[PDB]
Enzyme design. Structure first.
Site, PDB file in Angstrom:
ATOM      1  N   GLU A 110      67.524  29.902  53.391  1.00  0.00           N
ATOM      2  CA  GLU A 110      66.645  31.540  53.265  1.00  0.00           C
ATOM      3  C   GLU A 110      65.350  31.428  52.663  1.00  0.00           C
ATOM      4  OE1 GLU A 110      68.449  35.258  52.213  1.00  0.00           O
ATOM      5  OE2 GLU A 110      67.084  36.168  53.391  1.00  0.00           O
ATOM      6  N   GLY A 534      46.508  23.859  22.119  1.00  0.00           N
ATOM      7  CA  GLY A 534      47.278  24.084  23.459  1.00  0.00           C
ATOM      8  C   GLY A 534      48.013  22.429  24.239  1.00  0.00           C
ATOM      9  N   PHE A 538      49.159  19.873  31.803  1.00  0.00           N
ATOM     10  CA  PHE A 538      47.501  20.120  32.671  1.00  0.00           C
ATOM     11  C   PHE A 538      47.001  18.652  31.487  1.00  0.00           C
ATOM     12  CE2 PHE A 538      45.934  22.551  29.343  1.00  0.00           C
ATOM     13  CZ  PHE A 538      47.002  22.797  29.149  1.00  0.00           C
ATOM     14  N   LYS A 556      39.025  21.849  26.404  1.00  0.00           N
ATOM     15  CA  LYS A 556      40.476  21.675  28.020  1.00  0.00           C
ATOM     16  C   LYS A 556      39.919  20.284  28.042  1.00  0.00           C
ATOM     17  CE  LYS A 556      42.447  23.906  32.054  1.00  0.00           C
ATOM     18  NZ  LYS A 556      42.644  24.760  32.217  1.00  0.00           N
ATOM     19  N   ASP A 650      46.768  35.421  39.628  1.00  0.00           N
ATOM     20  CA  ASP A 650      47.703  34.535  38.422  1.00  0.00           C
ATOM     21  C   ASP A 650      47.523  35.408  37.365  1.00  0.00           C
ATOM     22  OD1 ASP A 650      49.961  33.224  37.406  1.00  0.00           O
ATOM     23  OD2 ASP A 650      48.424  31.651  36.602  1.00  0.00           O
ATOM     24  N   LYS A 652      48.761  37.865  34.523  1.00  0.00           N
ATOM     25  CA  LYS A 652      49.616  38.327  33.852  1.00  0.00           C
ATOM     26  C   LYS A 652      49.235  37.663  32.019  1.00  0.00           C
ATOM     27  CE  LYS A 652      50.916  33.250  33.826  1.00  0.00           C
ATOM     28  NZ  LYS A 652      51.830  32.202  33.997  1.00  0.00           N
ATOM     29  N   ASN A 655      47.691  35.157  30.795  1.00  0.00           N
ATOM     30  CA  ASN A 655      46.621  34.965  30.751  1.00  0.00           C
ATOM     31  C   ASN A 655      45.415  35.094  30.242  1.00  0.00           C
ATOM     32  OD1 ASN A 655      47.454  32.544  32.214  1.00  0.00           O
ATOM     33  ND2 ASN A 655      47.260  32.472  34.402  1.00  0.00           N
ATOM     34  N   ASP A 668      41.823  30.727  32.792  1.00  0.00           N
ATOM     35  CA  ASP A 668      42.776  30.156  33.411  1.00  0.00           C
ATOM     36  C   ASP A 668      42.845  30.403  34.873  1.00  0.00           C
ATOM     37  OD1 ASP A 668      44.091  28.396  31.495  1.00  0.00           O
ATOM     38  OD2 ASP A 668      45.987  29.007  31.484  1.00  0.00           O
ATOM     39  N   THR A 685      52.687  33.272  40.423  1.00  0.00           N
ATOM     40  CA  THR A 685      53.878  33.256  38.939  1.00  0.00           C
ATOM     41  C   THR A 685      53.967  34.063  39.440  1.00  0.00           C
ATOM     42  OG1 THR A 685      52.360  32.532  36.894  1.00  0.00           O
ATOM     43  CG2 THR A 685      54.760  33.465  36.748  1.00  0.00           C
TER      44      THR A 685
END
Ligand SMILES: CC(C)(C)n1nc(Oc2cccc(Cl)c2)c2c(N)ncnc21
Length: 811
Positions: A110, A534, A538, A556, A650, A652, A655, A668, A685
């Protein structure tokens, strides 16, 4: 016979490989189709689908033949197929130990229809038997095309109906989603003469017969439609429409239209009036709401031919718009022009409230006219001084386009506009001389000026352009000079001293720090890494110190091996694009991007107050004011993005960072995309993912509003609303799709619940914030009844938490 001396190159190269061995042609009989149709109606994703959609899926199923003791799927292998058992028996091995035994009618695999997932158990064929099966790629692509052709088909039929002609692109797309397909077999009455129906019907395929007083008037073909007037008015059906062959109709109901669009006449008229008003340079600077109010309150009147609509006997009219017909304009005895459909007149009297109306307006034929009176302007502007309010608003429209003033409270913005002084300049006067320290911001009222540096000309600016805004924030030499390049140049201006009496510390610190950081150029060799803040697959994020200016940043590093391994070639540039273009106070601000042999770099402002994930966990269950603040802040960021046709995808707490002052910063943009039509790719997510993403029939920016409801539920109630305990992605999506939304007994606030339930509405059409009004319906919800949105944007609220010191866990 010579040979070629110069070089020719060679050619290079899991569960889908095995099913190819078992694949086989077999004609689908009636017994098969009905067992497939039965088995899919009980399936997680397919249960919502109508019969024609399930019939289409049934044909894309493929026959697979198995001998006894053959492997179907292996626990650990990547999952790609869904199966319905046609004949024989199949045994399920979990940890090399038989759990169950399935026969004809049963299904398995499924989760493959939603996502690429690792298989839990190993299915093995006991007897000789056969499977009907379909692959994810084929299943999702088929779901895409079904819903997407339905939408495009329905939008053409919206475009062919005349009553929708004056809807905007965005309005037409929104009512396209309100279409419902309704099937009629021969004999069925679609509509009966005399009934007060509220439904427009459009024939997509087939033919139907029209009866008036039980007598055949005509026959209707694929394209024909009926019920436009039923969406505007309570009127009985003029005819009895009966289906002659099997027919399929798209349909809009007025009830759903009212939910999605509002009153259709009110919306249509607002567009007609907005378009007519925007032809004037005055009303062009009014807000969409101000123009909508003029439309809602305008006096509308029908006149016969040769009538003096206005004659120097005037009922306080300032502006006139022709909706139907023609009028001739006169100054005393001289004709000055003829206004046709959509044209208008009165700029002179809108600007000069007290002036005597000198013109005459005479109808040339039967006509429909809209009239804007003195009261209609005053009620629109919220002030009886129209000339002052129009002036005030002209200035407001200029400064609201600038970051510096855009997010200040309305009270602060008004004070600042009121403080503008005016001054005049002779041609050749140096308004600003380069090198000198400035203390004034200018807006050009009349004329032209020319920008120069070290002699050479850079640009030319005119009416309503501005310059010198940096002097309000910094004490610094003017980088350019501004010479008057016209006779009698007038500028509005405001002193720094006045600006500092209006703007308060927190907002000022935000502006000080932000404008400065983009101003200062940066190179990699000027940055020293203090510490790592961080990590992940990535790459890494380093806290960096810029030696020349001493401004601290965040850097980053996205490893090239990470992007090329998962085929995210086209995606990293689309992330650079979005992340660079964002210029909102609650969204992270990019400085520049650097290229390297190892990794792609993103340099942004340093956010020192930690993640929101941790902040709420320090707070526990958030109170009404605290949830208002954070959710309100997220709303402004998401709204900003939705206005730029970006869906975030995304949302949440992880972020969302917090700054020194305790205000949010969205980060993000990996899952974020510039929406052009309907998106189908499954991203984000799982706990925050909207049911429309999971069901594969198309989604838009509405998904972020669902996620907003998920976050609010976390804030007020604590746990997630769906799949809180669950780790398996299948069982999370199941709880998202069919689970029950409940609220703990300790949640005592009726309005909070109401909002959570409406943000977590499964169908987007019934989801607060997803109608034509957008976030206005969320912002005006009773939950925010005491919440000053104006102060949020301007940093005039005490936030829930202020961090003591710092906190961390083409290119
Ligand atoms: C805490 C972490 C590593 C998620 N993070 N991400 C951050 O956001 C960044 C940081 C650098 C580049 C990009 Cl595109 C995003 C960030 C920041 N600006 N300041 C402090 N911590 C930051």
């Amino acid at each position: 016979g010579m040979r070629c001396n110069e070089k020719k190159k060679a050619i290079f190269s899991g569960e889908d490989t095995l099913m190819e061995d078992h694949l086989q042609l077999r004609e689908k009989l009636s017994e098969d189709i009905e067992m497939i149709k039965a088995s899919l109606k009980n399936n997680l994703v397919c249960s919502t689908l109508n019969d024609n959609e399930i019939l289409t899926l049934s044909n894309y199923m493929q026959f697979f033949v198995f001998k006894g003791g053959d492997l179907v799927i292996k626990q650990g292998e990547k999952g790609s197929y869904f199966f319905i058992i046609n004949s024989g028996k199949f045994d399920v091995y979990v940890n090399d130990k038989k759990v169950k035994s399935m026969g004809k009618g049963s299904s398995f695999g499924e989760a493959a229809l939603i996502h690429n997932t690792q298989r839990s158990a190993t299915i093995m064929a006991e007897t000789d038997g056969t499977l009907w099966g379909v692959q994810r790629s084929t299943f999702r692509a088929t779901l895409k095309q079904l819903s997407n052709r339905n939408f495009n088909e329905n939008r053409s039929f919206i475009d062919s109906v005349s009553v929708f002609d004056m809807l905007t692109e965005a309005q037409k797309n929104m009512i396209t989603n309100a279409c419902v397909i309704q099937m009629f077999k021969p004999g069925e009455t679609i509509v009966k003469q005399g009934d007060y129906g509220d439904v427009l019907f459009i024939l997509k395929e087939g033919k139907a017969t029209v009866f008036i007083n039980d007598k055949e008037i005509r026959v209707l073909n694929k394209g024909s439609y009926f019920g436009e007037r039923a969406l505007l008015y309570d009127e009985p059906r003029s005819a009895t429409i009966i289906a002659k062959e099997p027919t399929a109709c798209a349909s809009i109901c007025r009830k759903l239209l009212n939910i999605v669009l509002g009153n259709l006449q009110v919306v249509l008229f607002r567009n007609i009036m907005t378009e007519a008003l925007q032809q004037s340079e005055i009303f062009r600077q009014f807000s969409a709401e101000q123009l909508n109010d003029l439309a809602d309150t305008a006096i509308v009147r029908d006149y016969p031919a040769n009538y003096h609509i206005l004659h120097k006997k005037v009922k306080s009219v300032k502006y006139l718009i022709v909706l139907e017909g023609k009028v001739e304009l006169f100054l005393d005895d001289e004709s000055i022009g003829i206004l046709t459909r959509g044209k208008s007149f009165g700029d002179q009297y809108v600007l000069n409230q007290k002036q005597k109306f000198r013109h005459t307006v005479k109808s040339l034929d039967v006509c429909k006219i809209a009239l804007i009176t003195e009261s209609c302007l005053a009620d629109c502007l919220g002030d009886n001084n129209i000339d002052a309010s129009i002036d005030h608003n002209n200035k407001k429209s200029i400064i609201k386009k600038m970051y510096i003033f855009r997010y200040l409270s309305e009270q602060q913005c008004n004070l600042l506009i009121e403080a503008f002084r005016t001054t005049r300049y002779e041609e050749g006067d140096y308004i600003i001389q380069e090198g000198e320290v400035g203390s004034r911001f200018y807006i050009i009222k009349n004329g032209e000026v020319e920008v120069t540096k070290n002699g050479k000309r850079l640009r030319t600016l005119g009416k309503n352009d501005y310059f010198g805004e940096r002097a309000l924030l910094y004490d610094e030499p003017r980088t350019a000079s501004i010479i008057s390049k016209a006779t009698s140049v007038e500028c509005w201006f405001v002193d720094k001293s006045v600006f500092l009496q209006i703007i308060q510390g927190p907002m000022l610190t935000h502006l000080e720090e932000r404008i400065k950081m983009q101003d200062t150029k940066v190179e990699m060799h000027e940055l020293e890494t203090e510490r790592i803040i961080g990590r992940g697959t990535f790459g890494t994020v380093k806290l960096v110190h810029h030696k020349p200016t001493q401004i601290r940043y965040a850097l980053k590093c996205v490893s090239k091996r990470s992007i090329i391994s998962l085929n995210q070639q086209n995606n990293i540039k689309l992330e650079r694009e979005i992340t660079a273009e964002n210029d909102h106070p609650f969204i992270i601000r990019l400085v520049r991007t650097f290229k390297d042999s190892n990794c792609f770099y993103f340099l942004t402002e340093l956010v020192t107050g930690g993640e929101l994930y941790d902040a709420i966990r320090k707070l526990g269950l958030l109170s009404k004011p605290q949830a208002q603040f954070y959710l309100g802040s997220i709303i402004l960021a998401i709204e900003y993005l939705h206005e730029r046709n970006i869906v975030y995808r995304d949302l949440k707490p992880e972020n969302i960072l917090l700054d020194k002052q305790g205000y949010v910063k969205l980060i993000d943009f990996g899952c974020a995309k510039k929406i052009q039509g309907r998106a189908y790719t499954l991203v984000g997510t799982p706990h925050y993912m909207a049911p429309e993403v999971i069901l594969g029939k198309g989604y838009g920016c509405t998904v972020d509003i669902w996620a907003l409801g998920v976050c609010l539920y976390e804030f007020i109630c604590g746990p997630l609303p769906f799949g809180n305990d669950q780790e398996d992605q299948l069982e999370i999506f199941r709880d998202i799709l069919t689970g029950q939304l409940t609220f703990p007994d300790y949640v005592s606030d009726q309005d909070s619940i109401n909002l959570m339930k409406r943000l977590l509405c499964r169908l987007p059409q019934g989801r607060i914030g997803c109608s034509i009004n957008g976030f206005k319906d969320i912002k005006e919800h009773a939950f925010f009844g005491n919440f000053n949105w104006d102060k949020l944007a301007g940093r005039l609220l005490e936030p829930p938490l202020v961090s003591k010191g710092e906190t961390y866990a083409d290119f």
